[PDB]
Amino acid sequence: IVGGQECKDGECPWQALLINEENEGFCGGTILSEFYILTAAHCLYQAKRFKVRVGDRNTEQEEGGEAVHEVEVVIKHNRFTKETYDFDIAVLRLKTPITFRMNVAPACLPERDWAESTLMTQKTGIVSGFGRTHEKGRQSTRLKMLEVPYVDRNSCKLSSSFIITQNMFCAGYDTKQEDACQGDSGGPHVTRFKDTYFVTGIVSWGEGCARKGKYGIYTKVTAFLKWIDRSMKTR
Protein backbone atom coordinates (compact mmCIF):
# COMPACT_ATOMS: atom_id res chain seq x y z
CA ILE A 1 0.00 0.00 0.00
CA VAL A 2 1.76 3.11 -1.32
CA GLY A 3 0.32 6.46 -0.28
CA GLY A 4 -3.20 6.59 1.10
CA GLN A 5 -3.93 7.38 4.74
CA GLU A 6 -3.59 5.48 8.00
CA CYS A 7 -6.75 3.75 9.19
CA LYS A 8 -8.44 5.46 12.13
CA ASP A 9 -9.46 3.47 15.20
CA GLY A 10 -12.84 1.78 14.87
CA GLU A 11 -12.83 1.76 11.05
CA CYS A 12 -10.88 -1.44 10.21
CA PRO A 13 -12.10 -4.10 12.68
CA TRP A 14 -12.44 -7.13 10.37
CA GLN A 15 -8.71 -7.76 9.86
CA ALA A 16 -6.48 -10.47 11.30
CA LEU A 17 -2.80 -11.31 10.88
CA LEU A 18 -0.96 -14.60 10.31
CA ILE A 19 2.23 -14.99 12.34
CA ASN A 20 5.16 -17.39 11.94
CA GLU A 21 7.46 -18.96 14.55
CA GLU A 22 9.34 -15.67 14.97
CA ASN A 23 5.91 -14.01 15.47
CA GLU A 24 6.10 -11.73 12.42
CA GLY A 25 3.15 -11.25 10.09
CA PHE A 26 3.32 -12.20 6.42
CA CYS A 27 -0.33 -12.60 5.33
CA GLY A 28 -3.73 -11.19 6.25
CA GLY A 29 -7.12 -12.72 6.87
CA THR A 30 -10.78 -11.79 7.15
CA ILE A 31 -12.92 -12.59 10.19
CA LEU A 32 -15.92 -14.27 8.57
CA SER A 33 -17.24 -15.88 11.77
CA GLU A 34 -16.04 -16.90 15.22
CA PHE A 35 -13.98 -19.81 13.82
CA TYR A 36 -13.55 -19.03 10.11
CA ILE A 37 -10.60 -17.33 8.41
CA LEU A 38 -10.29 -16.45 4.72
CA THR A 39 -6.82 -16.46 3.18
CA ALA A 40 -5.11 -16.80 -0.17
CA ALA A 41 -3.97 -20.26 -1.24
CA HIS A 42 -0.34 -19.28 -1.80
CA CYS A 43 0.11 -18.09 1.80
CA LEU A 44 -0.04 -21.75 2.90
CA TYR A 45 3.30 -22.71 1.30
CA GLN A 46 6.03 -20.31 2.45
CA ALA A 47 5.44 -21.15 6.14
CA LYS A 48 5.65 -24.63 7.65
CA ARG A 49 3.54 -23.74 10.70
CA PHE A 50 1.72 -20.62 11.82
CA LYS A 51 -0.64 -19.00 14.31
CA VAL A 52 -3.29 -16.27 14.08
CA ARG A 53 -3.17 -12.88 15.79
CA VAL A 54 -6.07 -10.47 16.29
CA GLY A 55 -6.63 -7.06 17.82
CA ASP A 56 -3.29 -5.40 17.05
CA ARG A 57 -3.04 -1.90 15.58
CA ASN A 58 0.77 -1.86 15.86
CA THR A 59 2.76 -4.95 14.85
CA GLU A 60 6.00 -3.51 16.27
CA GLN A 61 4.96 -3.51 19.93
CA GLU A 62 2.10 -4.80 22.06
CA GLU A 63 -0.57 -2.32 23.15
CA GLY A 64 -3.10 -4.49 25.00
CA GLY A 65 -6.13 -6.33 23.65
CA GLU A 66 -4.29 -8.52 21.15
CA ALA A 67 -5.05 -12.25 21.14
CA VAL A 68 -3.20 -15.31 19.84
CA HIS A 69 -5.02 -18.35 18.46
CA GLU A 70 -3.83 -21.70 17.10
CA VAL A 71 -5.03 -23.04 13.76
CA GLU A 72 -6.96 -26.32 13.60
CA VAL A 73 -7.40 -27.24 9.92
CA VAL A 74 -7.13 -25.71 6.43
CA ILE A 75 -9.24 -26.31 3.31
CA LYS A 76 -8.17 -25.33 -0.21
CA HIS A 77 -9.87 -25.43 -3.61
CA ASN A 78 -9.21 -28.59 -5.61
CA ARG A 79 -8.37 -26.78 -8.89
CA PHE A 80 -5.65 -24.42 -7.63
CA THR A 81 -2.78 -24.13 -10.13
CA LYS A 82 0.50 -22.40 -9.33
CA GLU A 83 0.91 -21.26 -12.95
CA THR A 84 -2.25 -19.24 -13.65
CA TYR A 85 -2.74 -18.31 -9.96
CA ASP A 86 -6.34 -19.47 -10.34
CA PHE A 87 -8.72 -20.47 -7.53
CA ASP A 88 -6.77 -18.50 -4.91
CA ILE A 89 -9.22 -19.10 -2.06
CA ALA A 90 -8.60 -20.91 1.23
CA VAL A 91 -10.62 -21.44 4.41
CA LEU A 92 -9.19 -21.90 7.91
CA ARG A 93 -10.98 -23.55 10.84
CA LEU A 94 -9.70 -22.41 14.25
CA LYS A 95 -9.95 -23.80 17.80
CA THR A 96 -10.94 -21.08 20.30
CA PRO A 97 -14.17 -19.10 19.75
CA ILE A 98 -12.93 -15.54 19.27
CA THR A 99 -14.27 -13.07 21.84
CA PHE A 100 -15.95 -10.19 20.04
CA ARG A 101 -15.14 -6.72 21.36
CA MET A 102 -14.40 -3.22 20.10
CA ASN A 103 -12.28 -3.18 16.91
CA VAL A 104 -13.04 -6.90 16.49
CA ALA A 105 -16.20 -7.64 14.49
CA PRO A 106 -17.02 -9.81 11.47
CA ALA A 107 -18.20 -8.60 8.07
CA CYS A 108 -21.24 -10.44 6.76
CA LEU A 109 -21.01 -12.19 3.41
CA PRO A 110 -23.55 -10.76 0.92
CA GLU A 111 -25.68 -12.62 -1.63
CA ARG A 112 -24.32 -13.13 -5.14
CA ASP A 113 -27.23 -11.68 -7.13
CA TRP A 114 -27.24 -8.38 -5.24
CA ALA A 115 -23.45 -8.13 -5.38
CA GLU A 116 -23.36 -8.51 -9.16
CA SER A 117 -26.45 -6.33 -9.63
CA THR A 118 -25.53 -3.39 -7.37
CA LEU A 119 -22.33 -3.80 -5.35
CA MET A 120 -19.97 -4.51 -8.24
CA THR A 121 -21.64 -1.77 -10.32
CA GLN A 122 -20.74 0.91 -7.76
CA LYS A 123 -17.87 3.39 -8.16
CA THR A 124 -15.10 2.51 -5.70
CA GLY A 125 -13.95 0.17 -2.92
CA ILE A 126 -11.62 0.11 0.07
CA VAL A 127 -8.52 -2.03 0.64
CA SER A 128 -6.27 -2.21 3.68
CA GLY A 129 -3.29 -3.99 5.17
CA PHE A 130 0.36 -3.68 6.18
CA GLY A 131 1.80 -3.35 2.70
CA ARG A 132 5.31 -2.27 1.82
CA THR A 133 5.81 1.47 1.37
CA HIS A 134 7.79 1.25 -1.90
CA GLU A 135 8.60 -1.15 -4.72
CA LYS A 136 11.31 -2.83 -2.61
CA GLY A 137 11.39 -0.67 0.52
CA ARG A 138 10.41 -1.31 4.14
CA GLN A 139 7.16 -2.76 5.45
CA SER A 140 4.90 -0.44 7.43
CA THR A 141 4.27 -1.19 11.10
CA ARG A 142 0.94 0.70 11.17
CA LEU A 143 -2.22 -0.64 9.56
CA LYS A 144 -3.15 1.44 6.51
CA MET A 145 -6.16 1.76 4.22
CA LEU A 146 -6.76 3.11 0.72
CA GLU A 147 -9.52 3.60 -1.84
CA VAL A 148 -9.54 2.29 -5.42
CA PRO A 149 -12.14 2.39 -8.25
CA TYR A 150 -13.13 -0.28 -10.77
CA VAL A 151 -12.04 -0.80 -14.38
CA ASP A 152 -14.04 -1.87 -17.44
CA ARG A 153 -13.55 -5.39 -18.77
CA ASN A 154 -12.14 -4.39 -22.17
CA SER A 155 -9.39 -2.19 -20.71
CA CYS A 156 -9.02 -4.78 -17.94
CA LYS A 157 -7.98 -7.45 -20.44
CA LEU A 158 -6.05 -5.05 -22.69
CA SER A 159 -3.92 -3.73 -19.81
CA SER A 160 -1.79 -6.76 -18.94
CA SER A 161 -0.03 -9.15 -21.32
CA PHE A 162 -0.81 -12.32 -19.34
CA ILE A 163 -3.98 -14.44 -19.23
CA ILE A 164 -6.98 -13.35 -17.14
CA THR A 165 -9.41 -15.92 -15.76
CA GLN A 166 -13.11 -15.29 -15.20
CA ASN A 167 -12.76 -15.91 -11.44
CA MET A 168 -10.82 -12.68 -10.80
CA PHE A 169 -11.02 -9.06 -11.94
CA CYS A 170 -8.71 -6.06 -12.10
CA ALA A 171 -8.68 -2.56 -10.65
CA GLY A 172 -6.25 0.26 -9.95
CA TYR A 173 -5.14 3.72 -10.97
CA ASP A 174 -3.28 4.54 -14.19
CA THR A 175 -0.27 6.65 -13.19
CA LYS A 176 -0.82 7.95 -9.64
CA GLN A 177 1.18 6.15 -6.94
CA GLU A 178 -1.88 4.53 -5.35
CA ASP A 179 -1.63 0.74 -5.37
CA ALA A 180 -1.00 -2.11 -2.95
CA CYS A 181 2.36 -3.87 -3.03
CA GLN A 182 3.73 -7.22 -1.89
CA GLY A 183 3.18 -8.40 1.67
CA ASP A 184 -0.60 -7.90 1.43
CA SER A 185 -1.40 -11.44 0.28
CA GLY A 186 -4.80 -12.53 1.55
CA GLY A 187 -5.93 -8.98 2.30
CA PRO A 188 -9.64 -8.15 2.19
CA HIS A 189 -11.39 -5.88 -0.29
CA VAL A 190 -14.65 -4.32 0.89
CA THR A 191 -17.42 -2.21 -0.62
CA ARG A 192 -19.62 0.40 1.03
CA PHE A 193 -23.39 0.57 0.52
CA LYS A 194 -25.18 3.14 2.71
CA ASP A 195 -22.36 2.83 5.28
CA THR A 196 -22.80 -0.97 5.29
CA TYR A 197 -19.63 -2.95 4.57
CA PHE A 198 -19.50 -6.10 2.43
CA VAL A 199 -16.44 -8.15 1.47
CA THR A 200 -16.21 -8.57 -2.30
CA GLY A 201 -12.69 -9.71 -3.16
CA ILE A 202 -9.25 -10.73 -1.95
CA VAL A 203 -5.98 -9.13 -3.07
CA SER A 204 -4.80 -11.88 -5.42
CA TRP A 205 -1.86 -10.86 -7.63
CA GLY A 206 -0.48 -8.40 -10.16
CA GLU A 207 3.00 -7.68 -11.49
CA GLY A 208 5.04 -4.81 -10.09
CA CYS A 209 3.88 -2.04 -7.77
CA ALA A 210 2.46 1.28 -9.01
CA ARG A 211 3.75 0.55 -12.52
CA LYS A 212 2.60 2.90 -15.26
CA GLY A 213 -0.53 1.70 -17.03
CA LYS A 214 -0.85 -1.46 -14.94
CA TYR A 215 -3.70 -2.85 -12.84
CA GLY A 216 -3.88 -5.25 -9.91
CA ILE A 217 -5.92 -8.46 -9.94
CA TYR A 218 -8.29 -9.37 -7.09
CA THR A 219 -10.04 -12.71 -6.67
CA LYS A 220 -13.79 -12.51 -7.29
CA VAL A 221 -15.52 -13.98 -4.24
CA THR A 222 -19.11 -13.60 -5.47
CA ALA A 223 -18.85 -16.69 -7.70
CA PHE A 224 -17.57 -18.98 -4.90
CA LEU A 225 -20.32 -18.43 -2.33
CA LYS A 226 -21.82 -21.92 -2.64
CA TRP A 227 -18.33 -23.34 -2.10
CA ILE A 228 -18.08 -21.01 0.89
CA ASP A 229 -21.49 -22.30 1.98
CA ARG A 230 -20.30 -25.90 1.68
CA SER A 231 -17.41 -24.92 3.97
CA MET A 232 -19.74 -23.40 6.58
CA LYS A 233 -20.44 -26.88 7.99
CA THR A 234 -17.01 -28.55 7.70
CA ARG A 235 -15.64 -29.58 11.11
Binding site: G10, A105, W114
Partner: protein, 54 residues
Protein backbone atom coordinates in the same frame (compact mmCIF):
# COMPACT_ATOMS: atom_id res chain seq x y z
CA UNK B 1 -40.34 -0.58 -7.49
CA UNK B 2 -40.53 -3.42 -10.01
CA UNK B 3 -37.09 -4.86 -9.17
CA UNK B 4 -34.61 -4.66 -6.30
CA UNK B 5 -32.02 -3.20 -8.71
CA UNK B 6 -33.40 0.28 -7.92
CA UNK B 7 -31.98 1.37 -4.54
CA UNK B 8 -31.90 -2.18 -3.13
CA UNK B 9 -35.65 -2.34 -3.68
CA UNK B 10 -36.11 0.21 -0.85
CA UNK B 11 -34.55 -2.37 1.51
CA UNK B 12 -31.56 -1.63 3.74
CA UNK B 13 -30.36 -5.25 3.44
CA UNK B 14 -30.85 -8.29 1.20
CA UNK B 15 -33.49 -7.90 -1.51
CA UNK B 16 -35.02 -10.20 -4.11
CA UNK B 17 -38.11 -10.75 -6.26
CA UNK B 18 -40.45 -13.44 -4.93
CA UNK B 19 -43.59 -14.05 -7.02
CA UNK B 20 -42.52 -11.06 -9.16
CA UNK B 21 -42.78 -8.91 -6.02
CA UNK B 22 -39.98 -7.00 -4.30
CA UNK B 23 -39.30 -8.53 -0.88
CA UNK B 24 -36.55 -7.83 1.66
CA UNK B 25 -34.58 -10.30 3.77
CA UNK B 26 -32.11 -9.58 6.56
CA UNK B 27 -28.71 -10.91 7.58
CA UNK B 28 -27.69 -12.49 10.89
CA UNK B 29 -28.50 -10.38 13.93
CA UNK B 30 -31.37 -8.67 12.08
CA UNK B 31 -35.05 -9.20 11.31
CA UNK B 32 -37.55 -7.47 9.03
CA UNK B 33 -39.51 -4.66 10.70
CA UNK B 34 -43.06 -3.36 10.27
CA UNK B 35 -42.27 -1.20 7.23
CA UNK B 36 -39.55 -3.62 6.12
CA UNK B 37 -37.07 -0.94 5.04
CA UNK B 38 -34.68 -1.39 7.99
CA UNK B 39 -33.94 -4.64 9.82
CA UNK B 40 -33.69 -4.03 13.57
CA UNK B 41 -30.57 -5.44 15.28
CA UNK B 42 -31.14 -8.59 17.32
CA UNK B 43 -27.64 -9.09 18.72
CA UNK B 44 -24.97 -7.43 20.85
CA UNK B 45 -22.52 -6.89 17.95
CA UNK B 46 -24.46 -7.14 14.68
CA UNK B 47 -22.45 -7.24 11.47
CA UNK B 48 -22.50 -4.71 8.63
CA UNK B 49 -21.44 -1.69 10.70
CA UNK B 50 -18.29 -0.32 12.30
CA UNK B 51 -18.11 -0.37 16.08
CA UNK B 52 -18.63 2.92 17.94
CA UNK B 53 -18.43 2.85 21.74
CA UNK B 54 -16.28 5.65 23.17
Amino acid sequence: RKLCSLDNGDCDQFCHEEQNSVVCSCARGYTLADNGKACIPTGPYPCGKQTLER
